[PDB]
Design a protein around this nucleic acid. Structure first.
Ligand SMILES: [Mg+2]
Ligand SMILES: [Mg+2]
Ligand SMILES: [Mg+2]
Ligand SMILES: [Mg+2]
Ligand SMILES: [Mg+2]
Ligand SMILES: [Mg+2]
Ligand SMILES: [Mg+2]
Ligand SMILES: [Mg+2]
Ligand SMILES: [Mg+2]
Ligand SMILES: [Mg+2]
Ligand SMILES: [Mg+2]
Ligand SMILES: [Mg+2]
Ligand SMILES: [Mg+2]
Ligand SMILES: [Mg+2]
Ligand SMILES: [Zn+2]
Lengths: 64, 196, 55, 100
RNA sequence: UUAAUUGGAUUCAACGCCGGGAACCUCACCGGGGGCGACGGCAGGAUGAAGGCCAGGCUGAAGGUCUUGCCGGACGCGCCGAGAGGAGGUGCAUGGCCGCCGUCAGCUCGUACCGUGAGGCGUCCACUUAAGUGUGGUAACGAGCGAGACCCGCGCCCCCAGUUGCCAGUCCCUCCCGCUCGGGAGGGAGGCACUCUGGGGGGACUGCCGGCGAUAAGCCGGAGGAAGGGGCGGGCGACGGUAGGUCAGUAUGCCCCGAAACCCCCGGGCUACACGCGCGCUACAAUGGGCGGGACAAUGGGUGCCGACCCCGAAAGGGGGAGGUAAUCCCCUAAACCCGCCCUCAGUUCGGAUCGCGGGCUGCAACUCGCCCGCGUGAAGCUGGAAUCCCUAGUACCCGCGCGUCAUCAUCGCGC
């Protein structure tokens, strides 16, 4: 099953609140921003975080 | 060919290290290093009691050099003795110390707690100690002491944690001691930091 | 002479011509690339020699 | 009038450091050097039974040792030859030089 | 059964297992022959201890012992303690390691609260997941180890690198064909295009679209894509239990032998054979057998070694011997497959067990007890009762090859 991991969600929520006006609904832009704003080194973890952040943006923009 | 050269050197170090570990037990032996120079071989030995290694003004260093050159294949050896860098972060040293403490006659709980307290005081993320043998009776038993953070399964546990093992020879038989320590600078894969 | 009744013949082939350099056992000796070690002794000293279990 | 240098080590990083040092030595002088050629890696693989006795299911260990290699060709210039003759390699790298 | 046929393991989890393919050795068994007591002391000892030898008997053979006399100079098992050594007992005295429950989802802690107490709660309920994996509700609120994350390899693209790897385009020389308009093959220059080798990087995230579910966690179906939902294959096995196996790999307590249960040498045995069982190989034929001819690999290994190339021999083999410490030289022009001819449903041109004669190789030694070759001989077997095993994709079936063991020997293990 594709169950998101706990620390991925935690760090994604932390990043979203710190810089709300920094991420869009585009995967590439979020990927670059996550790369620059943290010390993550695994290319897989970066993609997971960027995907969850994209979902968060599109969800809050809709207003839940 | 070339492979035979690499393997030949690796065996010499293993044999020498085992011999020294068995020989310099009371001096707190903590590893060695071998360097090759055009004049010969520089052999550095790490220990906690360099006086025991030197042995009252030589008479022991000369014997060690002679043994190394004759019994083993070292050419023109030269032995230097130094001090262990981080004695409380080396699992082998702590295991041997606990074994010696047991051989003296201390109850194993006191020895284990003293060792854990010292190691955690010197700034280690986690430690685990396991003692097995005929403790308090003729039916064997195993006990485990633990505190802190410690990885056990996976690649990080292979490359970050330091492990050591030792035997304690008492009157009734042998007692096995295992020690595992995690250094303060170890970082797990899921420890990510936000750049401010 | 009396000491001649204790020396062994210097064999050059067969199971009796090779012993583990660490424990002295005959039999399962690994002869690859010049190693002379038992299958028992090689397992517990392999990491020191630089071998690893990648897969 | 050309020298051939062979490098081999069990650690890739040290090999890269030595190769980069030789490359920079050649760069700081007027001398042509064919790039470091990567030769195939040596793998030494040993498979052993795990248990000391013969009881139970049979399981095996697969130990592996890897040896990396590089090749570098450079023309014999005494001004540049002395520098590479004095560079110090780590103890886990083997170097051999010959003139062709 | 025997002089001995050494020992361990008996459901899964004993029985091509102990890396166990034992001619000597290995060796632990059987027959026989020799040798060994640091260190203390007791008899003894230069008027020479302890020790060693030419020839010849005993002997399987032996200055082992004796006969016969020649050596050497300081210790002394004839005696008492003690010791080395022990594949001798105990895995139900232990350490370390390994199998199984099980790569299953479990095992706990701080404070609070409930119960007189053993204990309980969290760890429960609904949905979901490969997972105590998650989302909501909850006298619980939060943490740790395990799972995941992590490490190695495979498949797609980009940069750098060009030898010992690669040869397409361009030039030169030589030789063949349908006589050369054209088409091939070598060699030299020359190049890094392509393949390959190995460092760095990109790429996939339920990211996009439509449904179900709660609007959450997620699930189902599509687009593009080399790759789609742990992308595929491996490594890593928590707290504990199993008095599970191992003291016959090594370490080690206790008990035993301690001039034999220690150390050497020769010859036997582990290879016996009315019989029961496990795992396999070869067949019972045409979805074939034989003969001649034609095609295409990969992994690994080599100086106590791999050996191209020439000569001799019908074969197995024999005599010289370049190159190779190896991307350079060698092992190394696989088989199943394809084409033509003979056999035509038969115990046969199926099957090749068993035995006779002869020729070889390794080795100090081939009878017990090794492997190879030529001619001859030609057993059971014509598809298998009740039962029962393995396997979901480059997988299963079929076909060969490499390495380990190894002087010689592979119906085996691990890989291709
Ligand atoms: Mg076998
Ligand atoms: Mg045999
Ligand atoms: Mg024998
Ligand atoms: Mg109460
Ligand atoms: Mg309950
Ligand atoms: Mg969990
Ligand atoms: Mg895992
Ligand atoms: Mg047991
Ligand atoms: Mg038992
Ligand atoms: Mg047998
Ligand atoms: Mg038997
Ligand atoms: Mg036939
Ligand atoms: Mg015979
Ligand atoms: Mg028939
Ligand atoms: Zn061994």
């Amino acid at each position: 099953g594709k169950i998101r991991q706990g620390f991925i969600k935690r760090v994604a929520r932390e990043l979203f609140n710190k810089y709300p006006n920094e991420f869009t609904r585009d995967f590439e832009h979020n990927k670059k921003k996550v790369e620059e704003l943290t010390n993550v080194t695994s290319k897989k973890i970066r993609n997971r975080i960027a995907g969850y952040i994209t979902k968060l943006v599109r969800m809050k923009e809709e207003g839940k | 060919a070339i492979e035979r050269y690499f393997i030949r050197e690796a065996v010499k170090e293993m044999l020498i290290d085992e011999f020294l570990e068995k020989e310099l037990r009371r001096a707190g032996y903590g590893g060695l290093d071998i360097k090759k120079t055009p004049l010969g071989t520089k052999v550095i030995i790490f220990a906690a009691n360099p006086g025991y290694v030197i042995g009252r003004g030589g008479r022991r260093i000369r014997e060690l050099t002679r043994i190394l050159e004759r019994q083993f294949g070292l050419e023109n050896p030269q032995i230097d003795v130094q001090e262990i860098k981080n004695p409380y972060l080396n699992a082998k040293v702590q295991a041997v110390r606990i074994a010696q403490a047991l051989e003296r006659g201390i109850h194993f709980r006191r020895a284990a707690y003293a060792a854990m307290r010292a190691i955690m005081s010197n700034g280690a993320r986690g430690v685990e100690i396991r003692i097995s043998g005929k403790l308090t009776g003729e039916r064997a038993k195993s006990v485990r002491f633990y505190q802190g953070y410690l990885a056990k399964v996976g690649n990080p546990a292979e490359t970050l944690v330091s492990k050591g093992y030792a035997q304690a020879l008492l009157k009734l038989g042998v007692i096995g001691v295992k020690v595992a320590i995690m250094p303060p600078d170890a970082r797990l894969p899921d420890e990510i930091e936000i750049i401010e | 002479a009396k000491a001649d009744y204790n020396k062994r013949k210097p064999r050059k082939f067969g199971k009796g011509a090779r012993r583990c350099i660490r424990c002295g056992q005959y039999g399962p000796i690994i002869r690859i690339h010049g190693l002379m070690l038992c299958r028992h002794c090689f397992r517990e000293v392999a990491p020191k020699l630089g071998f690893r279990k990648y897969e | 009038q050309k020298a051939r240098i062979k490098l081999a080590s069990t650690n890739v990083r040290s090999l890269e450091e030595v190769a980069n040092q030789i490359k920079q030595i050649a760069e700081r002088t007027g001398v042509r050097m064919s790039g470091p050629i990567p030769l195939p890696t040596k793998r030494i693989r040993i498979v052993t039974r795990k248990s000391p006795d013969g009881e139970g299911s049979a399981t095996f260990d697969r130990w592996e040792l890897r040896i990396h290699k590089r090749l570098i060709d450079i023309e014999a210039d005494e001004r540049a030859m002395r520098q590479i003759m004095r560079i110090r390699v780590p103890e886990d790298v083997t170097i051999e030089i010959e003139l062709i």
